[PDB]
Structures are given as C-alpha cells and as structure tokens.
Amino acid sequence: VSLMEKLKWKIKCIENKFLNYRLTTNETVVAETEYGKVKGVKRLTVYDDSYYSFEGIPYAQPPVGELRFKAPQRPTPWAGVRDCCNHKDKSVQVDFITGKVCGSEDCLYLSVYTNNLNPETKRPVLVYIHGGGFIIGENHRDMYGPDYFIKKDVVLINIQYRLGALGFLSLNSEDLNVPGNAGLKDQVMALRWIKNNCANFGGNPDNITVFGESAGAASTHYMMLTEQTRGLFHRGILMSGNAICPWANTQCQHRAFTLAKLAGYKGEDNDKDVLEFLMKAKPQDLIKLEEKVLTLEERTNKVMFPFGPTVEPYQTADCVLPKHPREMVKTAWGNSIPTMMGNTSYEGLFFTSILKQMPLLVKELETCVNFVPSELADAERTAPETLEMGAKIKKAHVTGETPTADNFMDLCSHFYFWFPMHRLLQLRFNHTSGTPVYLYRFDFDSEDLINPYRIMRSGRGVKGVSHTDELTYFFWNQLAKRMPKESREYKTIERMTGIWTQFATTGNPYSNEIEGMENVSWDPIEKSDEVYKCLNISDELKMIDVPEMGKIKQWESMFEKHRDLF
Numbered sequence: 001v002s003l004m005e006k007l008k009w010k011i012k013c014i015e016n017k018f019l020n021y022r023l024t025t026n027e028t029v030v031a032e033t034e035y036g037k038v039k040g041v042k043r044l045t046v047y048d049d050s051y052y053s054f055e056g057i058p059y060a061q062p063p064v065g066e067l068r069f070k071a072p073q074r075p076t077p078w079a080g081v082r083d084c085c086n087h088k089d090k091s092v093q094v095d096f097i098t099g100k101v102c103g104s105e106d107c108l109y110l111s112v113y114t115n116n117l118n119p120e121t122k123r124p125v126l127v128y129i130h131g132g133g134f135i136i137g138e139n140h141r142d143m144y145g146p147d148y149f150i151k152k153d154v155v156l157i158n159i160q161y162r163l164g165a166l167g168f169l170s171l172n173s174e175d176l177n178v179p180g181n182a183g184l185k186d187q188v189m190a191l192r193w194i195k196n197n198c199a200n201f202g203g204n205p206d207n208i209t210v211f212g213e214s215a216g217a218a219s220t221h222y223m224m225l226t227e228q229t230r231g232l233f234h235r236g237i238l239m240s241g242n243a244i245c246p247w248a249n250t251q252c253q254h255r256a257f258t259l260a261k262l263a264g265y266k267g268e269d270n271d272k273d274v275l276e277f278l279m280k281a282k283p284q285d286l287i288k289l290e291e292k293v294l295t296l297e298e299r300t301n302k303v304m305f306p307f308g309p310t311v312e313p314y315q316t317a318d319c320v321l322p323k324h325p326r327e328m329v330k331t332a333w334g335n336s337i338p339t340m341m342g343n344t345s346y347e348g349l350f351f352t353s354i355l356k357q358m359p360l361l362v363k364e365l366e367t368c369v370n371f372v373p374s375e376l377a378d379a380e381r382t383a384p385e386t387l388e389m390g391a392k393i394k395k396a397h398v399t400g401e402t403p404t405a406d407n408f409m410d411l412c413s414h415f416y417f418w419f420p421m422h423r424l425l426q427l428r429f430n431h432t433s434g435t436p437v438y439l440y441r442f443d444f445d446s447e448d449l450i451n452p453y454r455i456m457r458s459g460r461g462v463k464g465v466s467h468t469d470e471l472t473y474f475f476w477n478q479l480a481k482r483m484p485k486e487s488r489e490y491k492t493i494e495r496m497t498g499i500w501t502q503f504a505t506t507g508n509p510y511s512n513e514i515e516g517m518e519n520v521s522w523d524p525i526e527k528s529d530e531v532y533k534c535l536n537i538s539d540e541l542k543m544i545d546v547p548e549m550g551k552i553k554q555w556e557s558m559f560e561k562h563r564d565l566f
Contacts, residue, residue: 001096001097001098001099001455001456005097005455006097006098009097009098009452009455012478012479013142013478015478016142016478019478020141020142022044023043023044023045023046024041024043024044025041025042025043025044025050027041027042028040028041028042028085029041029042029052029117030081031054031117031200031201032200033057033197033200034077034193034196034197035058035075035076035077035078036077036078036079036080036081036082037080037081037082038054038057038081038082038084039054039081039082039083039084039085040052040053040054040055040084040085040112041053041085045145045147045150045476046147046476046480046481046482047147047151047482049115049147049150049151050115050150051113051114051115051146051147051150052113052114052115052116052117052201053085053111053112053113053146054084054111054112054113054201055084055085055086055087055088055109055111055139055141056082056083056084056086056087056088056109056111057082057084057109057110057111057112057193058075058108058109059072059075059108059109059110059159059186059189059190059192059193060072060073060074060075060108060186060189060190061073061074061075061076061108062105062106062108063105063108063162063166063182063186064105064106066279068105068166068278068279068283069166069169069178069182069275069278069279070177070178070182071177071182071185071316071317071318072108072182072185072186072189072318074189075108087111087139087140087141088104088106088107088109088160089102089103089104089106089107090102090103090104090107090137090138090139090140090160091103091104091105091107091137091138091160091161091162091163091164091166091167092104092105092107092163092164092166092283092284092287093132093135093136093137093163093164093287094135094136094287094288094290094291096136096452096455096456097452097455097456101284101287101288103138105166105283107160107161107162108160108161108162108186108189108190109139109159109160110139110157110158110159110160110190110193110194111139111141111157111158111159112155112156112157112198112201113146113149113150113155113156113157113158114150114154114155114156114201114202114203115150115151115152115153116153116202117201117202118202119153119202122199122202122203122204122207123153123154123155123202123203123204124154124155124203124204124207124208124209124501124504124505125154125155125156125157125194125198125203125204125205125207125208125209125504126149126154126155126156126157126208126209126211126500126501126504127157127158127159127190127191127194127208127209127210127211127233128144128156128157128158128159128211128212128216128475129159129161129187129210129211129212129216129219129220129223130143130144130158130159130160130212130213130215130216131212131213131214131215131216131217131219131240131241131468132163132214132215132216133214133215133247133304133305133308134163134164134167134168134183134215134305134307134308134309135163135164135290135305135307136163137160137163137215137216138160139158139159139160141476142477142478143451143452143475143477143478144158144475144476144477145475145476145477145480146158146475146476147475147476148473148474148475148476148493148497149474149475149497149500149501151497152497152498152501154501154504155198155201155202155203157194157198159187159190160186161183161184161186161187161190161219162182162183162186163183164286164287164290164307165256165259165278165286165287165290165306165307166182166283166286166287167182167183167186167307168180168181168182168183168252168307168308168309168310169182169252169256169278169307170252170253170256170307170310170312170313171253171256171271171274171275172253172271172313173271173272174313174314175272176271176272176275177316178275179312179313179314179315179316179319180252180253180309180310180311180312180313180321181309181310181312181320181321183309184219184222184223184226184309184320184321185318185320187219187222187223188223188226188228188229188318188320191210191223191229191232191233192232194208194232195208195232195233206234207234207504207505208232208233208234208235209233209234209235209236209237209500209503209504210223210224210233210235210236210237211236211237211238211239211500212237212238212239212241213239213240213241213468213470213471214239214240214241214467214468215241215248216239216241217238217239217240217241217242218241218242218243218245218247218248218309220236220237220238221236221238221241221242221243221248221325221334221424222243222309222320222321222325223236223334224236224332224333224334224335224337224339225243225321225325225328225329225332225334226320226321226328227331227333228318228319228320229333229334230333231333233337234337234338234507235337235338235339235340235503235504235507236334236337236338236339236340237339237340237341237500237503238339238340238341238342239341239342239470240342240343240344240347240417240467240468240470241417242341242420242421242424243309243325243328243424244325244326244329244420244423244424244427245416245417245420246302246304246373246374246415246416246420247304247305247308247416248308248309248325248420249308249309249310249311249321249324249325250303250305250306250307250308250309250310251310251311252306252307252308252310253310253313255293255294255306255307256271256274256275256278257269257274258293258306259278259286259289259290259293259306260274260277260278262289262292262293263277263278263281263285263286263289265277265278290306290307293306293307294306297379300370300381301370301374301377301381302370302371302374302415309321311323311324326427329424329427329428329431330427330430330431331431332431335428335431335432335433335435336432336433336435337435337507338435338436338437338438338503338507338508339435339436339437339438340437340438340439340440340503340509341421341424341425341437341438341439341440342439342440342441342442342534343413343417343418343421343441343442344441344442344443344465344466344467344468344469344470345441345442345443345464345465345536345547346409346410346413346464346465346466347412347413347416347417347418347466347467348408348409348410348411348412348413348414348416348466348467349409349457349459349462349464349465349466349467350409350412350457350459350466350467350468351408351409351412351457352405352409352457352458352459352462352466353456353457353458355405355408355409356458359405361408362403362404362405362407362408363403364408365394365397365398365403365407365408365411366394366403367387367390367391367394368390368391368393368394368397368398368411369381369382369386369387369389369390371390371393371411371415372386372389372390372393372558373558375565376389376558376559376562376565377389389558392554392555392557392558393411393554393555393558395554396411396414396550396551396554396555397410397411397414397551410551413548414548414551414552414555417467418548418551418552419552419555419556422552422555422556423566425437425525425532426566429527435507436507436508436524436525437524437525438503438508438509438522438524438525438535439525439532439533439534439535439546440499440509440534440535440536440537441534441535441536441537441544441546441547442465442469442470442537443465443536443537443538444465444469444470444473444488444492444537444538444539445463445464445465445469445538446472446488446489446492447460447461448483448487448489449472449473449480449481449483449489450472450479450480451468451469451471451472451475451477451479451480452477452478452479453468453471454466454468454469470496473489473492473493473495473496473497474493474496474497474500488539491515491516492537494514494515495514495515495516495517495537495541496537498511498513498514499511499514502514509522509535510522516540516541517541520535520541520542520543521543522535522543531545531546531549532545532546532549533545533546534546
C-alpha cells in the first residue's frame with residue numbers, strides 16, 4: 001500500500017483514538033455472565049445516539065503455548081468484575097495498510113452492544129462474523145462499529161476467531177491433535193457463549209441471527225452446516241460468500257511443512273517434527289511468511305489462501321468439518337432455518353489491484369482454462385475437455401475478440417461468488433424442510449461514504465459496487481462521517497440495518513416501515529424456479545430477476561457430463 005495511504009491511515013488512527021475517547025461516557029454498568037461479572041461502558045455515536053459497550057469478553061482460553069494450533073478450550077472464570085471497557089487485540093495478521101504483522105495470539109474475544117440493557121421485552125440477537133479471507137480482520141470498532149445497528153432495538157455481538165496458519169494449520173498424524181479448523185472451532189465456542197449469555201444483555205436466546213460477509217459468510221454457512229452448532233441459532237445471512245465457494249475450503253495438510261521450511265525448519269517432512277518447530281516459532285514470523293507458502297501451480301489453479309477451512313483427516317471431540325462442505329449440506333440442520341443470501345452488483349471489481357500489478361492475468365481469458373472449477377479440470381489444464389469447459393466460461397464473459405480487465409473482473413464475480421451461490425441453492429433444495437431462502441443484490445454506488453477495504457482494493461475513484469462496498473452501510477468505521485439525514489447514503493444505512501433487523505426478528509426481510517419498500521413483494525426462491533428473483537437494492541428498491549442468471553446457467557453447463565459433481 002502507498003506511503004500516501006499509510007500516512008492518511010496513521011492520521012485517521014490518531015483521529016479515531018481521540019474520537020473514541022470523546023465518545024466515551026462515565027456510565028459504566030455491570031452485567032452477569034456464566035464466567036463472572038463484566039463491566040461495560042456507554043458510548044456515543046456521531047448521530048447523537050448511545051449504546052452500552054462490553055468489549056474483550058473471553059469466550060475461550062487464550063490459545064497460547066501448548067494450545068497453539070489446537071481446538072479452543074473454555075475460558076477460566078473469575079471472581080469480582082472483569083473490565084470490558086476496552087477492546088482486546090486482533091488475531092495475528094498482516095496489517096493490510098502498513099504491511100507489518102500486528103495482533104496477538106490472545107485474540108479469542110467478543111464484543112456486545114445494545115442501546116438498552118434492561119429492555120422491557122427480550123431483543124433479537126445479531127451475531128456478526130467478520131470476513132477477510134480467514135487471514136485478516138477484527139471486531140475493533142474502527143472497522144466494525146455498532147453505531148448504525150444500535151439505532152434499532154437489537155443486541156449486536158461481533159466476534160473474533162483465529163486467522164491464518166494459527167487458526168487453520170492441519171496435520172494428518174492423528175497423534176498430534178491438529179486436525180484443522182481451529183478458527184471455526186473458535187466461532188463454535190463463541191456461538192455457545194452467546195446462546196447461554198445473551199439473556200444477560202437483554203437478548204432473546206430463542207431468536208439469534210448469525211451473519212457475515214466474505215469469509216464471514218462462508219463462516220456463517222459452516223456454522224449452519226456443522227452438527228456442533230445444531231439449534232444454537234435461528235436465522236442466517238450469507239453476504240457475498242458461502243462454504244462451497246472455491247476460496248472457502250482447501251486441503252492444506254502438506255503446507256505445514258512448507259511454512260516450517262520458509263521459517264528456518266531443519267529436518268524431515270514428518271508431522272511430529274514440523275509441529276514441534278511451528279509450536280516454538282514466533283507467531284509474527286509464521287504469519288509474515290504465510291504469503292509465500294502457495295506454489296506457482298496452486299496459484300495458477302486459483303488456490304487463494306494456503307491455510308483455511310479443510311476437511312478434517314480424523315474426527316475428534318470438537319470436529320467441525322468431517323467431510324466436504326457439499327456433502328455436509330445433505331444433513332445440515334441449518335437448511336431448516338430462514339436464510340438470506342446475496343452479492344453486490346460488481347463483486348469482481350475487487351480484483352482491480354490484483355490486475356494492476358499483474359496485467360498478464362487478463363490473458364488467462366484467451367482460453368479461461370484456469371477458471372474451470374478445479375474438480376472438473378486436469379492438473380496441467382491442457383486436456384481437450386478442459387479447453388472445452390474453458391470455452392464455455394469464455395463465451396460467458398469475453399465480449400470482444402480480445403479479453404479485457406473488465407471481462408476478467410466480471411468473470412471473477414461468477415467464479416468466486418455467483419456460481420457457488422447457485423450450486424448451494426440447488427444442492428440445498430434437495431435436502432430442506434421448506435424453510436425460505438431470500439435473495440438480495442446490493443447495487444448502491446457512492447463515494448461520499450467509504451470503508452477501509454476500498455483502500456485495499458485500490459478502489460478510490462472506481463465506479464461500480466465491489467465486493468465489501470455494502471459494509472459501509474452496516475458498520476461504522478474510522479473513515480466514516482456523519483451524513484445528512486436526507487442523503488442517499490443515510491437512507492441506505494436505514495434500509496440495510498432495517499432489512500437485517502426485520503429478518504433477524506421474523507425470518508422475513510420485508511417490512512412496509514422501511515422507506516422504499518412500499519411496492520416490494522419479496523418472495524423466497526422455490527426449488528421449481530428456473531430463474532432467481534432478488535431484491536435489487538440501489539437508490540430504489542426493486543424486485544428483479546437476477547441479471548447474473550444467464551452467465552450462471554452457462555457455468556452450470558460445464559457440468560453437462562458430470563452432473564454428479566454439480
């Protein structure tokens with residue numbers, strides 16, 4: 001990231017520290033939890049609202065020393081009153097602005113926010129699981145401020161979980177108890193805490209909604225798939241992701257040795273010895289080298305991250321993913337809860353900075369072989385059948401005689417988001433009780449209000465609604481500002497937090513109290529639908545057939561002779 005954006009970020013971090021101070025009040029309060037009492041504090045917003053803030057609530061033991069790479073354990077309870085008036089650190093990660101490693105292994109915390117701690121009626125509880133590819137992110141209020149949602153009468157909870165290799169190392173040797181998915185296990189433990197504690201903050205333990213964006217969406221979906229979380233919540237919202245996205249799951253058992261060797265390991269590729277080295281290394285050295293683990297062949301085949309959610313090679317006590325996500329959809333308790341799913345109208349605009357650095361990537365579209373789903377393609381991607389499947393994609397996205405950056409970015413929208421969404425919907429319809437799924441398409445474009453991921457994707461000055469652009473209308477961040485109440489941005493804040501709150505409340509995202517919704521008739525997707533209907537959210541709200549449907553069916557046609565793998 002540029003020196004320019006680093007300095008502007010530094011000035012915003014100073015500005016955020018003073019504004020956070022200024023918006024703090026003297027009104028501390030104490031709530032009960034099953035682990036002891038916690039002290040929160042009331043905070044203010046730039047819209048002149050206020051909320052109670054409890055940050056740094058532990059949901060598991062700090063996963064340090066011998067607990068590194070292992071399933072979380074319950075935290076140790078305390079006497080007295082634990083201070084939750086300040087945030088804890090984020091999980092160890094490469095800071096996307098500075099390029100330096102930050103965070104701490106002591107990161108297994110959640111934060112709880114509500115405008116009223118003794119409501120007269122129990123409130124819907126919304127749980128947000130942040131994205132960032134399973135390698136970045138946090139629940140800090142400089143990125144995920146509850147300021148907008150606390151205008152509504154809900155309880156909002158923002159969790160952390162282990163990222164990168166510290167969260168997703170996986171080793172075959174059953175002796176070593178590192179099966180994988182430690183970070184998803186973290187999220188399971190956080191959900192258990194929320195179920196058994198939200199009542200203490202005015203929440204209804206029988207009305208809990210989990211939601212997340214990008215890796216957060218894939219995480220929410222894993223939470224709906226695994227038997228570990230059965231009945232822990234009642235609605236789910238998948239924003240720009242799910243667990244069968246090609247970036248959401250990887251078999252990374254081999255990659256631990258490689259990480260070890262980048263970090264100075266001397267010895268053989270054996271799991272016992274590799275783990276012993278990885279357990280002793282400095283956490284910031286491992287995370288810094290993570291970016292070099294993937295081979296050229298892996299990157300070619302579009303493996304995006306070296307460590308992430310994986311199929312666990314053996315089943316232990318806390319096993320989360322015992323089989324491939326496709327298989328897990330077959331018996332998933334969460335197929336039977338009300339669900340909402342959606343994407344933005346130009347998701348692949350997110351790859352703008354990846355294309356800037358590597359213009360040769362656009363030439364992949366001359367055959368598109370690299371974008372054929374890896375389960376259908378041959379290892380070298382030279383099989384004539386791979387070239388034929390690639391041709392199908394190529395026809396979906398290449399508009400001229402030569403491919404463009406735009407065709408590339410549009411192709412990415414489908415490969416990474418819409419096609420997996422299609423696959424999931426059709427799989428799920430073969431195994432559901434008939435609970436509704438509702439689709440939205442986020443199509444509201446502004447540059448008057450932004451979030452930090454626009455800096456990451458070099459998105460300044462770029463027209464269209466990229467992956468992550470909706471987060472600006474859900475959460476406060478340190479680049480935000482108070483918007484006039486009649487502004488298109490402020491209305492979109494109200495609509496998005498209103499629709500999410502309505503859904504969280506009733507399992508149906510429609511209300512006539514949301515301005516812009518007066519003509520909306522928003523039906524769920526049925527198994528017999530050939531074309532998907534969505535709520536298109538722009539300056540207007542309008543029910544439309546998904547514009548992406550034609551390109552989606554063209555992707556589906558790659559499976560004409562491999563229907564069992566669809």
